[PDB]
Point group: D2
Chain length 115, copies 4
């Protein structure tokens, strides 16, 4: 698992469950091509997005559909989605976790890149 | 001043100065049209992006050039940029401040929205 | 103004108004002596805590009353308060702004430090 | 494991390893009594702090010794330590994770409370 995503809810202090996540890779013409997607699990995680084979160096965008998450809970959100855009570089450690902490009018995101 | 951006640096404990910021508005054809841009001042603030007249209803993307910022300071960053995407003004004009706190492998952003 | 505090609310997208803040200074006997306190204004800011004269070298604890804030707004919070502990002025006077962003089960804080 | 602590480094995008963590419980006289402590592991985690038996309702303070962490890495920090102070309440879910994300002049902390 070269790429994993973890999403938490700062209002309830819980995983953010069943949140849609779409990953895209930047194509030669600068457009964003779909690459992987899924919904977070009961633990706020999303595994099995890719394989080492498909996960080549490039620029990637992770879009987390936070607006749908909050609206379904009856809480008015500010963002359309949260976005994380980064270059994957084979020079550093192998595994990337993209963690996001959601509030209705804020979010934070960190990357943990380990071997 | 209906859209402002404030950017802080969590490594140095300072405003993030001379950070490029681009704002785009989603067009009828789902492409991202340029809308406004500028650079943060010595206080980490960016005013003057737009006017109540120009800042119509719409989906806007504020993209903060975090990677150039960290590279200028000599520090290896993870993200290409930090993006904040939101629907604006759909119940009338509001004033938006978008604040972001930057670290090399993390950032946060928040919005403060007031009704004029 | 050598110590200021700014507090934002990440649920409402607004400044956090009327938030109580207490500052303590560590005493020679390792107890926390009261130093200054006040409440955030309509802009989420708190000025006037102290003066360059009174703000001597020392270890300070800034405690922001997040629990009362969330309880007033009708929202169940996790923390008792948010605490920021730091050595101040040990190479001469500096100006400190302590910014905090509040959610019911999370908060962040950052310092901006400038040399006068 | 009723209480776990997870610490990440926002400068390197990695777990914050070998960081000292001390937990205290507020005593009847308002003083802080030691309760548990340890150092984070290679994964930035710290398990086995307490048992359900000792972890009763009360007010707890988690102090994470961030100044020692940064100074050893040659990076000048602002805080003495990061502190998380909260009441444990048996009314909600059982397990508490206290997560902290460290930068030299900032930190964020969240709690994930699950069953």
């Amino acid at each position: 698992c070269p790429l994993m995503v973890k999403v938490l809810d700062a209002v309830r202090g819980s995983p953010a469950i069943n949140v849609a996540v779409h990953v895209f890779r930047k194509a030669a013409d600068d457009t964003w091509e779909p690459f992987a997607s899924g919904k977070t699990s009961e633990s706020g995680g999303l595994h099995g997005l890719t394989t080492e084979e498909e996960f080549v160096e490039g620029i990637y965008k992770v879009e987390i559909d936070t607006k749908s998450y909050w609206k379904a809970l009856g809480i008015s959100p500010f963002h359309e989605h949260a976005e994380v855009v980064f270059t994957a570089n084979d020079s550093g450690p192998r595994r990337y976790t993209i963690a996001a902490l959601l509030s209705p009018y804020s979010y934070s995101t960190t990357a943990v890149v380990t071997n």
